[PDB]
Design a protein around this ligand. Sequence first.
Ligand SMILES: COc1ccc(-c2ccc(C(=O)N[C@H](CO)C(C)(C)C)cc2C(=O)O)c(C(=O)Nc2ccc3c(N)nccc3c2)n1
Ligand SMILES: [Ca+2]
Lengths: 55, 254
Amino acid sequence: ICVNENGGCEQYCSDHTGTKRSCRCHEGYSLLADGVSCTPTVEYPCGKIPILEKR
Amino acid sequence: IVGGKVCPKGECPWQVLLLVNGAQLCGGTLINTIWVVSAAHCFDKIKNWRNLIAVLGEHDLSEHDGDEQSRRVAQVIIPSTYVPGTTNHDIALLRLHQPVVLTDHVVPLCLPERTFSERTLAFVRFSLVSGWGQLLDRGATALELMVLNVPRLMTQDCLQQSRKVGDSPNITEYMFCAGYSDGSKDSCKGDSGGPHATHYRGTWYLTGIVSWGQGCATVGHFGVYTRVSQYIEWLQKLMRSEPRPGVLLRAPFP
Ligand SMILES: COc1ccc(-c2ccc(C(=O)N[C@H](CO)C(C)(C)C)cc2C(=O)O)c(C(=O)Nc2ccc3c(N)nccc3c2)n1
Ligand SMILES: [Ca+2]
């Protein structure tokens, strides 16, 4: 599943036994209830540009 | 950087400037508050290991605007497989003496997981390369941070659409080509160690390090970048380890 379109994950994808997939996020992010999206948990998460985010 | 534009202040917040005795040495990429990724080759000629400084939040080298944060480099970690004066395994992991403070102008770039990087990021065509390096081949360096969008090539495609020069280094599985062969756009001397940053679903990731090339933006040639995905496990393990006395550390690779 992870091999095809990142298994639908916004960030990291982990393959499990059978048709099971778990998305994960980098530190400073938490996974939403949709099980695919990552949202920042900190003021300065990695890979986001504050002056562009605040616009 | 040749044929790019000025990176608007704060739009490249992970960019690092490395200095030795106050002089421009190389670039780097901040990946968290205390670790910086750069190129191993930047350290080939260092004798003054105690005078190595990383600057975060830098934009214009001619003025101090208060967003800059300077830190002494406590440790420079290089793979055992890297050979000084050569191009393979061109990566260095730098531990800052004290963490930088994250601000609107100082933000780490995400170091991705290996699988994510190889399966997904490796297929994102365009990525940004940045630095205060030469603006032209055999030209002056930039006072303001420069950025350039470059397409990534498959190594077979890079070797095929490249003019043979003789004694030209091989492009290994620890490298990738990116750029243009029409002599218009490329990274240059002085950009070495800087980020090759890839956007995916609203977030930027570290995929390459400015490494080497045959003349800046020369016809029939592309820029060559260290393939960061090969080093994720190596980097993660070192970041979980306690500092060791002495600045330079050679760590086994893999
Ligand atoms: C691998 O070992 C090495 C070893 C040394 C050098 C190298 C040699 C000389 C200089 C240099 O002139 N430095 C100046 C100060 O002495 C400076 C920083 C420009 C003001 C700078 C570099 C550098 O690290 O960028 C280089 C080098 O020039 N690297 C690159 C990187 C990317 C290139 C690219 N994308 N296209 C064309 C040429 C390219 C050259 N590579
Ligand atoms: Ca400045």
